[PDB]
Amino acid sequence: PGFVGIRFCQECNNMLYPKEDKENRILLYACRNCDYQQEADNSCIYVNKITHEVDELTQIIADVSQDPTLPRTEDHPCQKCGHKEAVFFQSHSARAEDAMRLYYVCTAPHCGHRWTE
Template sequence: MSQLDPQSQREKDKQSLHFCAECNNLLYPEVDRSNHVLLYSCRNCSHKEEARSNMVFKNDLKSVTKEQSGVIDSIATDPTLPRKHDSECPACGHPEAVYFQDQSKRIHNRMILFYVCTACEHCYGDELASSER
């Protein structure tokens, strides 16, 4: 296994979600005050692992990012999201995508689904919502 340089490892660690090795649920940051260690713990099965970095969240106000319906970098690999196997990606044609509802984009209180291609991570909305915009 190849080692990343320290800067690349910090970049990788600061933005990634952590998932439980036992049950694949999201791990949440927790402090072990007796040992002065940051841990990630599962709220489902009590699995714990030590954090590789002390950074839990970084709010970089200098970088300007385009709005992507609440999508995060590793959302396509989230095992807790439902998957659709017949949703063709408009960017690459791949048939599988994860999907979620984003309340901030709803039109007249309708449910709008957003899809993220599992191959190229392209984000696209449901067809009905796109045709009404």
């Protein structure tokens, strides 16, 4: 699933809306303010993640290695570059709902590698 984004009209940059081509039996995305229509590649119209399962490592920002106030450890070396010091922190978020997982970020500048243990 993931999530489903938006398509915009080439003529007028309004949002394209899904509708069926009832005679070819194919999903179209179609503009509501002009004649523009686009054939869909995806078939999926919509997904909704009640469990909110997503990889939080996509939401950790590598620049956070610069924060003076986070704890850092050589006890967990980075895979990509081998650098010993990593900064570590919890979710810093709602919607973890329970967990106390630690996320690690490499402190070596311009490495920015992020992982969880």
